[PDB]
Design a binder for this molecule. Structure first.
Ligand code: TD6
Ligand code: TD6
Ligand code: CA
Ligand code: CA
Ligand code: MG
Ligand code: MG
Lengths: 830, 97, 830, 97
C-alpha cells in the first residue's frame, strides 16, 4: 500500500492514543485485570517504524511518535481529555502531557519519600496504639498524602490565599497531621470518634518556595458526598469576602476547593452531579474544584461492577467537560506531577479537574472483617503487595537516584517519624440588644430606589406599576408582604450587611411578587433596585451588597451551598428560597445532617434562612406544605428558629432581628403564596418604624380598636393565613364571644408572651388549636403534646380543629380542599 | 555577647523563637532531646549540628532525609556568616554574630 | 504544500465533524444565538474541493466528503457519539448517520402530519375549553407526539411487548390521547388536576406494520425526575415476569422504558445521574432507556446559563457513554428518524440513548405570566414563529411532496380532529386468612440448604461455621435474627413467591450476619443457599426465586427502584435494606412522594419492605436512628405498617404475613445491629411452627414460666433491644413489682391487644414509655399524644423515660451514650 | 343475505364489530354521523365510502389524509372481492360477500 495510506493510519493511530490510550495505561497497582493489556498493526508494520511522518510542523519516525504516545498515555497516567469541547483546553493538556518530562530532582524525590514516611508512620501508630481504627485506614492509599501536598504547594506557588478541603473519614487524622498540620496533642486529646467529623484550620509552608497558604478542612456527616455543595458555598463566601472571583475585583479565585472522594460514593451519589452542575454558574462558581478520588477499587464489600455502569468511577465529571487523570497509586512522582498539572489547568481555565488515584484497601472495611470472604482474589493479590513507601525507596535505589547511605537516612527518618508520634501521645497522659425598626426616610429611600432607574432603561409595561406601587407604599402605607421583605433586606444593605438571596426563579419570584432584578424590555439588561442602598447619599459605600440569583433546578446542592455560604461568612444574611416548600424534602440530608444539627455535633454555626412557600389553596399535595411538623420534630432548645408570620411588618422585624441579633442560628420561615396579594394582609408605616418582632399576636380590635376581651369565651389559637378567614367570618357573623390569637414564632415556643396574652381573656371556657394541615401534620403533633406540659394552667383541655389525618400533605382535588376549609371555619364557629 | 552566635526562626511554626549558640556542638532536629527542637515531619530525628571550633561557626548535616541548606544552597558542611539563612526541613533560621 | 499535508488535514477535518459538528448544527428552531454559525480553511482551499482523498476503501473528492459530513452532522441533527468507549457502537452510529438517507414516503409524511394535526388540535381544545391549562401546554413542542409515536412504532417493529412511559406534566393529557390512546370521555370525566399524575395503560397499533404493543404510563409526583428510578424498577419487575432480559431466558428486554424530561430538571436533579448509574448493573439494568428531553430552552423564568454548567442539558448522559442526538423540533421527519435510530441502538447494544428535542414554550409558564418580563428577546422571537403543523404543511407543498388538494385534505383532517375532541367532551355533560407458621421439615430444609453446597465448592474458613450453625439452629433451636429472616424468605420461595432483596452490601450483610450469597475461596464463584428452595424434592419448580443483589452507593435511586419493582409485580416480596437507617433520608423524596402517599393520591399500591438498621450503641448520630418519629408522622390509617420486632421469630411471622396477607401495603422495619448477636434475642423451633405475629408482647415468665402479674405495680412499655437490658436488670435486682410490655407493631397501633394485655395487671399504679431515642424522637412524640386519646382508661397519666430532646439522633461520644443508657435503666427502676 | 355484503373489524379498538353493506353508499369516517363510525385520530372526519352500483361493491377514498388501502395497496377507488382487507386509518376491516 501507498505512503498516503500509511500516513492516514498514523494520523488515526495518533488520535487512537489521545482518545483511548487511557484504557491500556498501567494505572492499577494490583494488576487485577489479566486481560487489560496490538493497536499498532492496522496497515502499519515493523517496516514502517523508521519511516518518517509529518507532525505539528516537523517530520518524525513512527517509533519516535509511538514512544511519545506510549510515555504520555500508556504508562502510569491515564489521560482523558478529548471529550472537552473547548479546543484551547485540549491543546493545553496535549502540550503538557506529550512533552519530554524532566525527572524530579533528588531533593523533590527525597521530599516525596519524607511525606510517605510521615503517612505510613501515622497509619502504623493508629493501628498499633488504638483498637477499632481499621475503618479509617489509609493503608494502601498513603500516596494521597504527597499528592495532596503537591496540590497545596502548587496553589501556594500561584500565590493563592487558601485551600479548603472536604473529605470522607478514610485517612482524615493523617490529613490533619501531615497536610493541615494539626499537632498530635490536639488530634489525640481524648480518644474514645467526633474527631473524624470536626473542621480544622492550619498554615501550609512551601518546602522549596517562598510562600505560605492557609489550609482548612470543613466539618461533615457520615453521609458520603453530602458535604460536596457545602464546601462549594463555603469557598464562594470566602472568595466574595476576599474580593476574588465572580463577585470580586480579580479573576484569581484565590480560595481553592480540594474535594476528596471514595470510588463507590463518587459514582452512586446524585449530589456529585448536582455540585458539578454548579461549577460554572454565576451564582455558584468557585473557579474550579480539584477533585481526588481515592480509588481503592472496592466499596465496603461491593465490587466496582455492582457500583457503577461506566468504565471509571469519575465518568460523571464528563458532564461538565472536566479533564480526568487516572493515576497509579504506586507511582508517587506521577501522583504529585498530575496534582500540579491539575492546579495549573484550574488556574488557566477556572474549571474542575478530576484525579482518579488508583490504589487498594490493605485491611477489611472495619475491625472484624475478613475481606477475602467477599473478595478472595483481590485480597490474595493485596496480601503479597509491598507498601508504597518501601516500594518507592526500592525504586530510587534501583534507578540509582539515591545512594545506600541515603536509603538508610530515609529509613532512619521513618523510625524517627514513628518515634515522634508514639512519644508526643505518650507525654499526653449572646443576643445583641438592637432595634429592628427603621425611620420613615429608610422606607422612602427603598421605595424611591425602585423608580431610580438607569439612564435609557426600558421597563416592561407590567413591571412599571410594581415599581410605582412600591414608591406609593413607602410614602402612604398599605405595605404588602413582597415589599416588606425588600424593606428588610434593603435596610440591612444600607447598614453595611452582605445579603445573598437565591432559589428557583427567586429574582422575579415564583408568584411574580419579588422583582428584585428587572429586565430591560429592548436590550435584556438587568437592574437591581436594592443595589442602590449599597451606596450612601454622599456616594461612599456602606459595605453592603445585594447578591440575588436564580438557582439551578436543584434542592440538595442549592440548600447545601447556601448552608456552606453562611458558614463561610457568619456576617452575611443568607436566604435560600424553595419554589414551594413541598420540594425542600429533596434537600433532607442537608436539613438533617447540617442545618438542624451541625452546632450540637461539631460546634459549627450557621445563620442560613430557608423560605418555604406554604399554605392550603387546592393546588395539590406537592404545592401545599413545607412540612411544618418535620422541622418542629427536628427542633431542640437553641437548634433553629421556626416561624410562620401572618403580617408583612412582623416578617420584616423577623428578618431584621435574624440579621442583627449577633447569634448564628438557622431560620425556617413558612412563607405565603395567595396571602401575598391578600388586601387585608397589609401593614402600616408605623408597624415598621415604631414596633419590633411579635412572637404572639392579638386582633387589632383588642390592641388599637374598641374590642372588649371580657366578652370572649372561646379562644382560637392559630398561625398563618387562616387567621384572615377566621377574622372575616367573625366580622360577617358579628361574634364578640370569639377571639383569634396568632403564634408567629413556632419555635422556640414563646411561653411567657403566650401566658401574658391568654391572661387578658379571663372568661375563656374553651381553647382550640386551629390549622389547615391534617391532624398528623402542621403544628398540632408537637403543640398538642408540649402546650399542656409547658403551660398547664393555660392549655390543659386544648382541643384540635383541623383537616383529618392524611398520608399526603393534602387532597388532590381543589373542590375537596374548598369543602374541607369551610368545615374548619364552620367548626371553629360551631 | 561576643564570640556567641544567635539563631532566629523566621519561617516555621515557631517563628520568632531564638536559640543561643554558646557550645562546641549544638544539635538541631526532631528528637525532643535536641538543643534546637524543630517539630515537623520535614525535619529528621537527627538532622543538623551547629559546631563551634576556633572562631568560626559551622552547620553540618548529620544524615537527614531533606538535607540542610545555607542561603538556598544544599550543603554537607558550611562555615556561617552574620545574616546567613539555614533551612532545616520547612524551618528557615537566621544566623546572627 | 504537499498532497501528504493536504491528506492529513482532510483526515483531521473528518474527525472535527464527527467530534464537533453538533456545535454547528441547525438544532435551534428559534435561532436565538446569532454567533452559532470556516472550519474547512485549515491548509485546505477552494482549489482542493475537486482533489480526491482516500476514505474507508474508496477515493472521494473533498466536496463529496464535505456534503456527506454536513448532511450527517450539521443539518437539523446534532450527533454526539465519539465519547463512547466501545468502538463497535461508534462504527454502528457512524454507518447509519453518514449513509445517504432515502426520504420518507408520502404515506409516512402524511402520517407524521396526521399526528401533528392531532397534537395541535388537542392543545387548541385544552387552552380554549378550560382555564388554567397554560402550565401544561405542549405548544411549541407538539413534534414530541410524532417522535414518541416513532419510538413506540419502532419497538412494535422489533416485536417487543410493552413501552412504559415516565414523564412530567407538560403535554401529559396530549400523550394520553394521542400516544397511550385513552378516550376523551375518560381523560375529561370530571375536570377541575389529579389527571396530571395518574397511571394509564393502552394498546398501540402500528399504521404500516402487523404488530401491536402495550403502552403504559406510570404515576408520578410534581417532583421533577423523582419517578426516573421508579420507572426503571417497574420495567425490570415486568421484564422478570416476562422471562426477558438479565433474569430471563432471552436477551430481548422486551419491556422498554421511555423516559421524558424537562431541560432544567434533567441537568439539576441528582436522581438523573443516580438512575443512569443503574443502566448496566446486573440487579437494575432494563436493557437501556430511551430518553426524551423536551428542550424548550427555559425553566419557568430561568435561562439555560443559570441552570447548567455544560453546553447541553443532556451532558450527564456522557457519564455512562450514551449516544446523544440533538434534534430540531421544527423538523418532525428528523425527529421521527432519530427516534427510530435510538430504538435500534438500544436493541443492538442494550444501553440508553438520549434524544434532545430542541423546541420552545409558546406561552408563559402559567396563566397570568407575561414571559417577556424575564425573557423579552426569546418571546419577541417566539411571537413571530409559525406553528410546527402549518410549517410542516408549508414544507411538504414547497418540496412538492404533497399536492394542494392533499394540503386541503390535511387542513380538513385538522378541523375534523378539533371537532372530534370538542364534540365528544360536549356529549359528556381485604386480608387473606393464611397461617404464617411452617412445619419443622421446612425449617430443617432451609438449614440443610446452607450445607447442600455445589460439587467442588470451597467455602471461606470463616463462612463454614455460619453454614453449620444454621443447620444446628434448624434442628435444635436457639435461632438468631439473621437465620429467622432467611427462614421467612426461603419458606416463601418454597411456596412459589418471587423474593427480591437488595441494598448496600446486602448479600453478606453490613454486620457479616446474612451470607445470602457465599464466595468460592479459590474461584470467586457465587452460591445462593435459598435458591435451592425454588425446586421441590421431586425436582419440579415451585415458581419461587431468590433475587439478591448488592446495590450501588445510592439511596434515592435504590429505594425508588425497589418501590417501582413492587408496583411492577404486586406478587413479589420486595425488600430494600439501608446500610444504617440513618442514610434513608437521602431517599426522602421517594418515602414522601411515593411509598407513604401513592395509594391515597393515585390509587397506586406498593408492598415494598424497607429494612432500617436502628439502635443506640454509641456509634454516632449517623449510625443510630432510622428516624422512627418521621415514619410515624407520615402514617395515616392504612398508609403503611411500621414495626420494630425484638424477637427473631416475631420478625419471621411479620415478613411471612407481609408476603401472604393479599394486601399491598408498604412495610417499614427498624432492624437490629448488635441485637443480631445478643444470646438472649434468640427463638425456639415452636415459635416458628406453633405461633403467629404478635403486635404486643409480654415477658415469657408471665406466659410460659411462673410469673405473678398481680405483684406488678409499675409497667414499662417499650420497643426494640432496650427490653433485654431492662429484663437483665429485673433478673439481677430480682424485681417482681415491675413488668415489661413490648409494642412490636408501632403502626397501626394495636389498640385491642394493648388493652387486653394491660388488663392482666390489675395492681398497676404508674405506666411509663421507655425508649433509647431523645424525647423529640422515637415513638414518644406520637404515642405520648395518641395512647391517652385512643385508650383513656389505660394511658392517662403515661409518663416518659428516655434520652433528653436533641437536635441530632444521638450524642457523638460513645462514653456519653453509655452514661445516658444506664440513666434510663436507673430511672425505669428508680 | 344474498346481494348484501359484510365488514368485520379485525384490527382496531373495536375489533369484532360488524357493519352490514345494504345501501347504495355507506360512509366510513370519524364524523359521529358516519354509517361506519371508526373512532381514531388516524381516521379523517370524512374518510371513505363503500358504494354499491349494479352487483359490485366498491371502496372509494373521499379526501382522507391517511388514505384507503385494499390488501396493503393504496387506492383512490377499488372493486372489492370476498376476503379483501380494507385499511381506514389504523383499522383493518375484512370484506365478506
Ligand atoms: C450517603 C451514605 N450512604 C451510605 C453510607 C454507608 N457506608 C459507609 C459507612 O457509613 C458504614 C460502614 C462502616 O461501618 O464503615 S462506608 C460505605 C462504603 C464507601 O465506599 P467508597 O465510597 O468506595 O469508600 P471507601 O470506604 O474509602 O472505599 C458505605 C456504603 C454512607 N456513609 N453514606
Ligand atoms: C424537584 C422539583 N423541584 C422544583 C419544582 C418546581 N418547578 C415546577 C412546578 O412544580 C412549579 C411551578 C408551577 O406552578 O408550574 S416547574 C419548574 C421548572 C421546570 O423546568 P423544566 O425542567 O425545563 O421543564 P418545563 O417546565 O417543561 O420547561 C420547577 C422548578 C418541581 N416541580 N420539582
Ligand atoms: Ca443571626
Ligand atoms: Ca402484602
Ligand atoms: Mg472505595
Ligand atoms: Mg424547560
Amino acid at each position: 500500500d501507498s505512503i498516503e495510506d500509511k500516513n492516514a493510519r498514523v494520523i488515526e493511530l495518533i488520535a487512537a492514543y489521545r482518545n483511548r490510550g487511557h484504557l491500556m495505561a498501567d494505572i492499577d497497582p494490583l494488576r487485577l485485570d489479566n486481560t487489560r493489556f496490538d493497536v499498532n498493526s492496522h496497515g502499519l508494520t515493523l517496516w514502517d517504524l523508521d519511516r518518517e511522518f509529518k507532525v505539528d510542523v516537523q517530520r518524525k519516525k513512527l517509533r519516535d511518535i509511538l514512544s511519545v504516545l506510549r510515555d504520555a498515555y500508556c504508562r502510569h497516567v491515564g489521560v482523558e481529555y478529548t471529550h472537552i469541547l473547548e479546543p484551547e483546553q485540549q491543546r493545553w493538556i496535549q502540550e503538557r502531557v506529550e512533552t519530554k518530562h524532566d525527572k524530579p530532582t533528588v531533593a523533590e524525590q527525597k521530599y516525596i519519600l519524607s511525606k510517605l514516611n510521615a503517612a505510613e508512620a501515622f497509619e502504623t501508630f493508629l493501628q498499633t496504639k488504638y483498637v477499632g481504627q481499621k475503618r479509617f485506614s489509609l493503608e494502601g492509599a498513603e500516596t494521597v498524602i504527597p499528592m495532596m501536598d503537591a496540590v497545596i504547594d502548587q496553589c501556594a506557588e500561584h500565590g493563592l490565599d487558601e485551600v479548603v478541603i472536604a473529605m470522607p473519614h478514610r485517612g482524615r487524622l493523617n490529613v490533619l497531621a501531615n497536610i493541615v498540620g494539626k499537632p498530635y496533642s490536639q488530634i489525640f486529646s481524648e480518644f474514645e470518634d467526633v474527631k473524624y467529623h470536626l473542621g480544622a484550620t492550619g498554615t501550609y509552608i512551601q518546602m522549596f518556595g517562598d510562600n505560605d497558604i492557609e489550609v482548612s478542612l470543613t466539618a461533615n456527616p457520615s453521609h458520603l458526598e453530602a458535604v460536596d455543595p457545602v464546601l462549594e458555598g463555603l469557598v464562594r463566601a470566602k472568595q466574595d469576602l476576599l474580593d476574588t472571583g465572580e463577585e470580586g475585583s480579580d479573576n484569581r479565585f484565590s480560595v481553592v476547593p480540594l474535594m476528596l472522594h471514595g470510588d463507590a460514593a463518587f459514582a452512586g451519589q446524585g449530589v456529585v452531579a448536582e455540585t458539578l452542575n454548579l461549577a460554572l454558574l454565576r451564582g455558584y462558581r468557585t473557579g474550579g474544584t480539584i477533585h481526588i478520588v481515592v480509588n481503592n477499587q472496592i466499596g465496603f464489600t461491593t465490587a466496582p461492577t455492582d457500583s457503577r455502569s461506566s468504565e471509571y468511577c469519575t465518568d460523571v465529571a464528563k458532564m461538565i467537560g472536566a479533564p480526568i487523570f487516572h493515576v497509579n497509586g504506586d507511582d508517587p512522582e506521577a501522583c504529585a506531577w498530575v496534582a500540579r498539572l491539575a492546579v495549573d489547568f484550574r488556574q488557566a481555565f477556572k474549571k474542575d479537574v478530576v484525579i482518579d488515584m488508583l490504589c487498594y484497601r490493605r485491611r477489611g472495611h472495619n475491625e472484624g472483617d475478613d475481606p477475602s470472604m467477599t473478595q478472595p482474589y483481590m485480597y490474595d493479590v493485596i496480601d503479597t503487595k509491598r507498601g508504597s513507601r518501601k516500594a518507592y525507596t526500592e525504586a530510587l535505589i534501583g534507578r540509582g537516584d539515591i545512594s545506600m547511605k541515603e536509603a538508610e537516612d530515609a529509613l532512619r527518618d521513618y523510625q524517627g517519624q514513628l518515634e515522634a508520634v508514639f512519644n508526643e501521645v505518650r507525654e499526653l497522659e449572646i443576643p445583641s440588644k438592637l432595634a429592628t425598626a427603621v425611620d420613615k426616610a429608610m422606607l422612602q429611600r427603598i421605595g424611591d430606589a425602585h423608580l431610580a432607574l438607569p439612564e435609557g432603561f426600558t421597563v416592561h409595561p407590567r413591571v412599571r406599576p410594581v415599581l410605582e406601587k412600591r414608591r406609593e407604599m413607602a410614602y402612604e402605607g398599605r405595605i404588602d408582604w413582597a415589599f416588606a421583605e425588600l424593606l428588610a433586606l434593603g435596610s440591612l444593605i444600607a447598614e453595611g450587611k452582605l445579603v445573598r438571596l437565591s432559589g428557583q426563579d427567586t429574582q422575579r419570584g415564583t408568584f411574580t411578587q419579588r422583582h428584585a432584578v428587572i429586565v430591560d424590555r429592548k436590550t435584556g439588561e438587568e437592574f437591581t433596585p436594592l443595589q442602590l442602598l449599597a451606596t450612601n447619599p454622599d456616594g461612599t459605600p456602606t459595605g453592603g451588597k445585594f447578591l440575588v440569583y436564580n438557582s439551578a433546578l436543584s434542592e440538595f446542592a442549592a440548600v447545601g451551598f447556601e448552608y456552606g455560604y453562611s458558614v463561610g461568612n457568619p456576617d452575611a444574611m443568607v436566604l435560600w428560597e424553595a419554589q414551594f416548600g413541598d420540594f425542600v424534602n429533596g434537600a433532607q440530608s442537608i436539613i438533617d445532617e447540617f442545618i438542624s444539627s451541625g452546632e450540637a455535633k461539631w460546634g459549627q454555626l450557621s445563620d442560613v434562612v430557608l423560605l418555604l412557600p406554604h399554605g392550603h389553596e387546592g393546588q395539590g399535595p406537592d404545592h401545599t406544605s413545607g412540612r411544618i411538623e418535620r422541622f418542629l420534630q427536628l427542633w431542640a432548645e437553641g437548634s433553629m428558629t421556626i416561624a410562620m408570620p401572618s403580617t408583612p411588618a412582623n416578617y420584616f422585624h423577623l428578618l431584621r432581628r435574624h440579621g442583627k441579633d449577633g447569634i448564628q442560628r438557622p431560620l425556617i420561615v413558612f412563607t405565603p403564596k395567595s396571602m401575598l396579594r391578600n388586601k387585608a394582609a397589609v401593614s402600616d408605616i408605623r408597624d415598621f418604624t415604631e414596633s419590633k418582632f411579635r412572637s404572639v399576636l392579638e386582633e387589632p380590635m383588642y390592641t388599637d380598636g374598641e374590642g372588649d376581651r371580657n366578652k370572649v369565651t372561646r379562644l382560637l389559637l392559630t398561625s398563618g393565613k387562616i387567621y384572615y378567614e377566621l377574622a372575616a367570618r367573625k366580622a360577617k357573623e358579628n361574634r364578640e364571644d370569639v377571639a383569634i390569637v396568632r403564634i408567629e414564632q413556632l419555635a422556640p415556643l414563646p411561653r411567657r408572651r403566650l401566658a401574658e396574652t391568654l391572661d387578658r381573656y379571663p372568661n375563656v371556657k374553651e381553647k382550640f388549636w386551629v390549622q389547615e394541615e391534617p391532624a398528623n401534620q402542621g403544628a398540632w403533633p408537637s403543640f398538642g403534646l408540649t402546650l399542656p406540659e409547658i403551660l398547664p394552667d393555660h392549655f390543659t383541655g386544648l382541643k384540635r380543629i383541623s383537616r383529618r389525618a392524611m398520608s399526603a400533605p393534602s387532597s388532590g382535588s381543589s373542590k375537596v380542599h374548598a369543602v374541607e376549609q369551610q368545615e374548619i371555619l364552620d367548626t371553629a364557629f360551631g | 555577647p561576643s564570640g556567641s552566635a544567635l539563631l532566629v526562626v523566621k519561617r516555621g511554626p515557631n517563628a520568632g523563637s531564638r536559640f543561643l549558640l554558646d557550645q562546641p556542638t549544638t544539635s538541631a532536629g526532631r528528637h525532643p532531646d535536641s538543643d534546637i527542637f524543630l517539630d515537623d515531619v520535614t525535619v529528621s530525628r537527627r538532622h543538623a549540628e551547629f559546631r563551634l571550633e576556633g572562631g568560626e561557626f559551622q552547620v553540618v548535616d548529620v544524615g537527614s532525609l531533606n538535607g540542610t541548606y545555607v542561603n538556598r544552597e544544599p550543603v554537607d558542611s558550611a562555615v556561617l556568616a552574620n545574616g546567613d539563612e539555614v533551612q532545616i526541613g520547612k524551618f528557615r533560621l537566621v544566623f546572627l554574630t
